[PDB]
Amino acid sequence: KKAGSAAAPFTHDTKISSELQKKEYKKEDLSKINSDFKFWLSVENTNINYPVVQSKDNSYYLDKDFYKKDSISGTLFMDYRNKSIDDKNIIIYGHNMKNKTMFNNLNKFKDADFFKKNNKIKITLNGKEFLYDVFSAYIVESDYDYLKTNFNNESDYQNYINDITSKSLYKSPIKVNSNDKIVTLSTATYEFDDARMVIHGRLI
Amino acid sequence: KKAGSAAAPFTHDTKISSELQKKEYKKEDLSKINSDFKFWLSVENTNINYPVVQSKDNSYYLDKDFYKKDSISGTLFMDYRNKSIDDKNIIIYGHNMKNKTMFNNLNKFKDADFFKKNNKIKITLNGKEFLYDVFSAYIVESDYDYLKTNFNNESDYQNYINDITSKSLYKSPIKVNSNDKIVTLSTATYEFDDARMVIHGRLI
């Protein structure tokens, strides 16, 4: 009946994802299933609990599953510019799906209270967990690209931080400086989307 | 470089779509390529100029090209409920793509000045061209399901008309009533889109 409500495509990704959640919990090595795998990602009080891959660009995995087959949800993925631990800003992209999956829940950070509750973003890499507090959340337009992974100096990075901080829908009691590391979570799509969600966390 | 801007998947759909424009101009029979083919759709002062198909639901052709292959743009398709030439409302669905293809240009109707230009919708079927005047246009939440192909009586139909007329961002000269036939063009997607375009024309 409803346009784009058919079950089989969501079932595909739902089945793949949950199976991977199990495998991750048992500490199986997911990079033996896709060498593109980098780390696991979760966010407190969301359903965001997924693997993150990376490829040559910022598109391949939007409509591809963890086994590289076509899929409407895709797999979360790190920006292709990211290289290492040391990067100042880790950027991760995902669909906003209609059964409220992938990065859909990023929308919760629009609630004033949820945002004050200070839910953490969590990255798990080779059995070591890294935590980030959200200091900035906002909504951007289809072709928003103010998303930088690396910087020439302490000063450029500070300016980027001042900028993305001033953009926040809500003021956070966390000042970030040029010695911090940050994470950026972004909605992304091949379709036109003027309501894209952008979240920034600070490494605790 | 930028998230979801990889050329290749768009190239796939541009190639197909412009070949089919050439085939339709030549008056080739497109139902020999795909049985599901129904008619041709264009809209004045837009790049909307595509083939319309129908499956047995409202999802299959969202991410399938006219050769029933995976594609990020899909193929414009008619609501499965439209069975007859005497249906009171014909309803067609399409993607709002980032490269401004498919039903992107429905968004042009958000402009008061494009709206009052009376740009007509065009259905070409078996040689015969059928023309419609756009009398309502608006934005709807991801959920919107107030899309009805048929009605039990002229009172039910008039109420439907009255309602969708009230939603228009703009008032139109054109009065619609329960003896009219109408077309409905809706943006649609597997993702969450609280900014999707619905427009309605009236058969001339």
Author numbering:
A (entry chain B), B (entry chain A): 39 to 242
Sentences from the paper on this structure:
The C. difficile 630 genome possesses two genes with homology to known sortase genes in other species, but as one of these is interrupted by an in-frame stop codon, it is thought that only one sortase (SrtB) is present in the bacterium. A recent study demonstrated that SrtB recognises the LPxTG motif within putative sortase substrates. Characterisation the products of the reaction of SrtB with an SPKTG peptide in the presence or absence of meso-DAP clearly demonstrates that the C. difficile sortase is capable of the transpeptidation reactions characteristic of the sortase class, and responsible for their anchoring of proteins to the cell wall.
Despite extensive attempts, it was not possible to crystallise wild type C. difficile SrtB, either under the optimal condition for SrtB C226A or any other condition tested in high throughput screening. The crystal structure of C. difficile SrtB C226A reveals a fold that is characteristic of the class B sortases, consisting of an eight stranded discontinuous beta barrel, decorated on its surface by several alpha and 310 helices. No metal ions were observed in the β6/β7 loop known to participate in Ca2+ ion binding in S. aureus SrtA. A modelled active site was therefore constructed by reversing the mutation in-silico and adjusting the side chain torsion angles to match those of the analogous residues in the S. aureus and B. anthracis SrtB enzymes. The β6/β7 loop of the C. difficile SrtB C226A contains an identical pairing of tyrosine and leucine, suggesting that the ‘SP' portion of the C. difficile sorting signal may be recognised in a similar manner.
